[PDB]
Write an enzyme that holds these catalytic residues in place. Structure first.
Site, PDB file in Angstrom:
ATOM      1  N   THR F   1       0.834  -1.195   0.000  1.00 19.39           N
ATOM      2  CA  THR F   1       0.000   0.000   0.000  1.00 19.39           C
ATOM      3  C   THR F   1       0.905   1.297   0.000  1.00 19.39           C
ATOM      4  O   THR F   1       2.108   1.171  -0.192  1.00 19.39           O
ATOM      5  CB  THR F   1      -0.975  -0.083   1.221  1.00 19.39           C
ATOM      6  OG1 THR F   1      -0.822  -1.356   1.852  1.00 19.39           O
ATOM      7  CG2 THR F   1      -2.413   0.074   0.766  1.00 19.39           C
ATOM      8  N   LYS F  33      -8.130   1.932   3.574  1.00 19.99           N
ATOM      9  CA  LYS F  33      -6.934   1.625   4.349  1.00 19.99           C
ATOM     10  C   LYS F  33      -6.770   2.531   5.560  1.00 19.99           C
ATOM     11  O   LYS F  33      -5.951   2.248   6.439  1.00 19.99           O
ATOM     12  CB  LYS F  33      -5.683   1.697   3.458  1.00 19.99           C
ATOM     13  CG  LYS F  33      -5.847   1.052   2.070  1.00 19.99           C
ATOM     14  CD  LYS F  33      -4.581   0.307   1.654  1.00 19.99           C
ATOM     15  CE  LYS F  33      -4.655  -0.272   0.246  1.00 19.99           C
ATOM     16  NZ  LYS F  33      -4.112   0.666  -0.758  1.00 19.99           N
ATOM     17  N   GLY F  45      -4.059   4.328   9.862  1.00 22.04           N
ATOM     18  CA  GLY F  45      -3.843   3.834   8.519  1.00 22.04           C
ATOM     19  C   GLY F  45      -2.919   2.646   8.656  1.00 22.04           C
ATOM     20  O   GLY F  45      -1.928   2.718   9.382  1.00 22.04           O
ATOM     21  N   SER F 125       4.864  -0.026   0.749  1.00 26.59           N
ATOM     22  CA  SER F 125       5.771  -0.004  -0.395  1.00 26.59           C
ATOM     23  C   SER F 125       5.880   1.400  -1.002  1.00 26.59           C
ATOM     24  O   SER F 125       6.973   1.889  -1.260  1.00 26.59           O
ATOM     25  CB  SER F 125       5.300  -1.012  -1.445  1.00 26.59           C
ATOM     26  OG  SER F 125       3.934  -0.845  -1.773  1.00 26.59           O
ATOM     27  N   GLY F 157       1.311   6.781  -6.285  1.00 26.96           N
ATOM     28  CA  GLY F 157       0.571   5.731  -6.962  1.00 26.96           C
ATOM     29  C   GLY F 157       1.092   5.479  -8.369  1.00 26.96           C
ATOM     30  O   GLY F 157       0.925   4.363  -8.925  1.00 26.96           O
ATOM     31  N   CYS F 160       4.654   3.445  -7.536  1.00 22.59           N
ATOM     32  CA  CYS F 160       4.541   2.134  -6.940  1.00 22.59           C
ATOM     33  C   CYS F 160       3.501   1.316  -7.703  1.00 22.59           C
ATOM     34  O   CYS F 160       2.397   1.800  -8.004  1.00 22.59           O
ATOM     35  CB  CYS F 160       4.166   2.237  -5.475  1.00 22.59           C
ATOM     36  SG  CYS F 160       4.130   0.631  -4.698  1.00 22.59           S
ATOM     37  N   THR F 163       0.269   0.431  -5.647  1.00 25.30           N
ATOM     38  CA  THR F 163      -0.476   1.586  -5.168  1.00 25.30           C
ATOM     39  C   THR F 163      -1.257   2.208  -6.320  1.00 25.30           C
ATOM     40  O   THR F 163      -0.710   2.407  -7.427  1.00 25.30           O
ATOM     41  CB  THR F 163       0.498   2.626  -4.588  1.00 25.30           C
ATOM     42  OG1 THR F 163       1.205   2.033  -3.498  1.00 25.30           O
ATOM     43  CG2 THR F 163      -0.232   3.889  -4.137  1.00 25.30           C
TER      44      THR F 163
END
Lengths: 111, 173, 173, 173, 173, 173, 173, 173, 173, 173
Positions: F1, F33, F45, F125, F157, F160, F163
């Protein structure tokens, strides 16, 4: 077998010392009379059943906890209202307890 | 295996092939991977190597026939039995469970997952192949949740070497 | 794959499935893993990795061309191009080759192998399955070569997750 | 990546995403993984490692140039430069090439593969996803080739963490 | 090992070789792998390395002579002893059990498996070789379940290097 | 995440994407999350693979609703349950918790960490990518802690592969 | 290392740290990882193993010398010396090259990559950190290219254990 | 980390940097690695990954405030809690403890070590680097134990990639 | 070690060398590997690394001097202590036990094995070498069981590098 | 370490170096590896990594000061505490113990070993080097058991990289 909606309707009156009678008497001693109409007995059997199919199914004992919430307003100020015939009907029962939807299960612990 | 579940028009279908794989050999090819629970009130399809796959199944039953068949609650009651101090072992498998109301995916590690808006669920090696064909259909065809599950399963049996065209499908109501 | 060959009653048959598998997925199902060489007078079936399988085959062919199609000599000549100082390059692939007179199994590191008495040869991940089923039928029935091939292949496609049922069979009048 | 090709109604379409991923991070998102060759009369989409993917592509091009653009022959000619004594050098990359007449999938160890009856081809980590989605749509709708490509590509970009949604699609009048 | 069980004409046979392997050496070659249970009411063949292979055998006995020899119930009662909260260790072996009524295969991991329509079961390294010859025979010959087990066992001893031609066969009634 | 938390102008924001990854495939892409705790008094979170990631969440709750929502004390009370003689298992996950007063990061291994002077926290991550954009902004822009979390999450996002741009953000008061 | 490049307002800047790290120790801290080529009209910064990084650099230079300094053509010409039959030899190093007109990232296996719209490039273990920081600043401030480079470099030296804060920045008038 | 302790002229100093490393990234860079114990009577520096590193710290406290701050006895009382029949888990960390009287190094495996004649102690990845500069100084300079710890720590932060120049030093009396 | 036992003419011999090996070095070379049990009624030779090899020995004694020296029963009583729900650890060793009546081989895993028709038993790295010479002799010579054990042990010390010519032999009566 | 013990002329010596090794670095170089037990009645030298090496030492003391210093009995009483059903953990170390009467070597795995005829014992990485020099001397010189141990220890410090020339020797009476 388990007790249905109709079966909860009968257990509320027919049995000797039923909840309808027990409260009719325990409130008569206060000097107050109370009417339990039939269209209001359905909304107490099919309102204590609605709660047994959305939580633990405690059975008939669910009626006691329902009635105790209904005869909550009256049981307190019954003495200070001597000599009165209160009509407990669909309109009274409805706005007597409120509503009981499931907890929140989901949104709490599920991704 | 390949286990898929589509939900369209008050319909909840759950299918799965029937290939029990041992190494790269096929031991049994008829196996019922989708079973019925709570007198026929809920559908359950499993994947993840017999043993664990099964004990996960049983544990979800002992939770349904102890919570009046309330899928969601039974699910969480079971999940919580892993997320405690004293764990409940750890199972190499996962389940797709669904009744008239909801549909879920429970893993023997202790987690419950709800579908995405389209209400489609798949698990197992052939998982995503079926999930790809399913979404394809649901979003572009009128086919019933049964026809789709049927179609999606085959598409996945022809790509996964651990999935066959010998499936068993169950639906509600 | 599964490639098997039975020789019985002046008949030589070579058959194989058609499943090309990349990893644990299936890319093609209608592959022709058995083909005719040297003016259709010789059968070749190949297992192993695709590319090498093909080069090993294309190589045997050039040899067959240079040696009036003597199956036996061609195999030896080819094997001898690995069994020397200057290596040829190890191929991860085997061939089962056969003509009117002989049945042989050639490999990619150079070495020709002859069948045992029963004249049955099989290669591929599902080789032994076909081999077992074939030995059974040859020893206990009057089934023709072709039938035994056809039968064994399936018995094997049913056990090997890498062998399907789409067969390609060739016999030699 | 994810590259898929559908041929239907005298139309040939080859589409692919644009995510160049180094490790588990993303370097580029607008990559063109499908390009036109031989005077725009042939489509090529490539998966696998960037450099090899490119050399594998640039190689097929030179072949195309030397053979009047015969897709099929150029493929074989190139495959034959791996299937020999003097290796060419194994390339970790695959191509999906197509012109008005044929659709083919070439790899970097030399071996050309034809599609199955449905005339659908897909490669890349997110291949089978697009392949499943594609087979589903081709078998159950009247959607054009282009649409099926566009649709499958997304269905796959949604499942593969290495495939994004920035597509580059090419069709062949 | 190689343990196979065929069922034809109210006949239930269960054979197995007799080679106890240690590493790539042979320690004992006469070993009885198929034993009788419940006064001779049920047949049991095991595979999976002595120790576990044995304790699994015993555990199925303490369940038969505690359930009136009801194979199926004894099986499940045993399986359930693994699928609980507090596991029953884990055994590196499996059994093929069969009486006049049914035939099964029980693994020391906690699962019971029923044969497929043909009613043939095999286990152990030489497993599938026997299973291949068995199916071959059952489906193409008139041979008795005994003759078949006998024939299938030999076919498997000649392919598996952990299986010999020194077997012990038991039948019911 | 990617879970990130910025704090500027009596503002405490905590965002995170919504991608549940299984292998290199995406199973669910909307997942919340960042959840709320203690009647909405604290933000949490998580990151680290469902199960553990969750049981770590629960354990911090049973500690808040047992210490009047005193973040810091609840944190340490929880941490100390790992630093004893009899450990509390070991969780493959970590949390970012924050209320109007403080903000922290608690690992299921038994340690509590306070931010650095800038008061920015990120985990998962996609962690450092967000943390890099955050510091970039906080130190060079006037943007609110919400705008920053929003902006930083997207930057992460797009780098990754685990993500997405589908996030859920919560703030206090 | 960390090498980043931002281009904004007719300005092109390439900057990087100076930490040469052997194992988990540090050998040199004042290394110049960005240098000028072709009569100072083109910037080059390199990450990857030292030697390779240098040969990759010296190679691009010879190319730049042979092509009137055309950055784009030189890159391609150099790439093409890997993308052929006779390999050049894989180099474990990347370069970021830039001149007045273009910014490019070249690797040691031959493949030139262009930036995405934002015209930002970064390489090295600390790449994405600088990249995230840079994207943030370019999208949310009016900071000059130089400043953003300087800024991001630090934000990354602070997160990467292999990147220090001793920078060497070069801009192109 | 880098934790070093020098003792010169009735002086006992204990320094350590402040870098919490996660993978090859830096999560927190101010962290206090040297803490005070027993109302300020003893100095303790730890190394070995947060969690264990901490629980080792606490366990030595519960032993000091249970033995009147008698370092040596508290040490051994703690060590003996590992050297028994029923172990005390096992910690991935070690401590450097010192008061006006003695100085030690205690490992969470159950052993106590006394310095060598020069009374210098160092632990952590940056260990020996500081220990080398320390001995260098102590043996060839007049510098105070504080100046030395200060100087030796920096020398070690410039060589270890897991040690920074942001340290916290404590001394007695 | 090499432990061998031959039985000819009412004679039961049990020999074994005397080399205790540690790594590839020899620590003790006289060691008695064949001991006497139950007042001299039974012979026991062990192999399998001291500790376990020994505790297996003791456990068979506490079972003989609790069953009147009934070898077979004592053996099984011991074996059964492993084949239960609550295992008896697991021993890395095995024993060859023999009295005037029977001879066996018991493994610390929980299994008892009877010799093959010739009544020859061997264990340990040098095992099969001795067993090969033994069978050779017994089947082709008149030599006494003692002479054979003696001869076979030497043949095995000259091939096994963990076996010497320094042995101790015991016989019954 | 290198621990050696020679016995000549009613003399029992036990020496050992003093190098505590951590990885390939030296942490402490004076360490006393040979200690005295039972008021000075027995000598003990250990090897095998502090912790276990020590707890093995203590456990042999609690057994001597509970058996009147009877070396051999104390040894066996300790060994038997490993060879039971409920093991005593497992120690990564070994001891050389000797009094006026006997000399032994006890391993924390549960075994006791007596010297060979020459009465020389050595343990540790530098073990065999000392044992080689020792036997060399004992068998070819008149040197006292002390001079020998002294000499043999040095020979081993100059070959083992984990052994120094800083040793501590103890003798009896």
């Amino acid at each position: 077998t388990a007790l249905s909606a109709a079966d909860f309707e009968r257990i509320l009156t027919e049995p000797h010392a039923s909840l309808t009678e027990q409260y009719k008497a325990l409130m008569a001693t206060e000097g107050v009379n109370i009417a339990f109409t039939t269209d209001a007995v359905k909304k107490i059997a099919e309102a204590a059943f609605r709660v047994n199919e959305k939580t633990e199914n405690i059975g008939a004992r669910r009626l006691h906890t329902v009635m105790e919430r209904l005869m909550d307003k009256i049981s307190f100020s019954a003495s200070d209202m001597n000599g009165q015939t209160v009509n407990i009907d669909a309109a009274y029962v409805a706005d007597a307890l409120g509503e009981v939807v499931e907890n929140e299960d989901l949104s709490r612990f599920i991704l | 295996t390949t286990i898929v579940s589509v939900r369209r028009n008050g319909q909840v279908v759950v299918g799965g092939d029937g290939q029990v794989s041992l190494g790269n050999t096929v031991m049994k090819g008829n196996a019922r991977k989708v079973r019925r629970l709570y007198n026929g009130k809920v559908l359950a399809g499993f994947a993840g190597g017999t043993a664990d796959a099964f004990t996960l199944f049983e544990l979800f039953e002992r939770k349904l026939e102890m919570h009046q068949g309330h899928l969601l609650k039974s699910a969480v009651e079971l999940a919580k039995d892993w997320r405690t101090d004293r764990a409940l072992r750890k199972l190499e498998a996962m389940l797709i469970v669904a009744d008239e109301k909801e549909s879920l995916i429970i893993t023997g590690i202790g987690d419950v997952v709800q579908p995405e808006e389209d209400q489609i669920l798949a698990i197992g090696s052939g998982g995503n192949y079926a999930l790809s064909a399913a979404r394809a259909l649901v979003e572009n065809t009128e086919l019933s949740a049964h026809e789709i599950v049927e179609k999606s399963l085959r598409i996945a049996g022809d790509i996964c070497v651990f999935t066959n065209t010998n499936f068993t499908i169950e639906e509600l109501p």
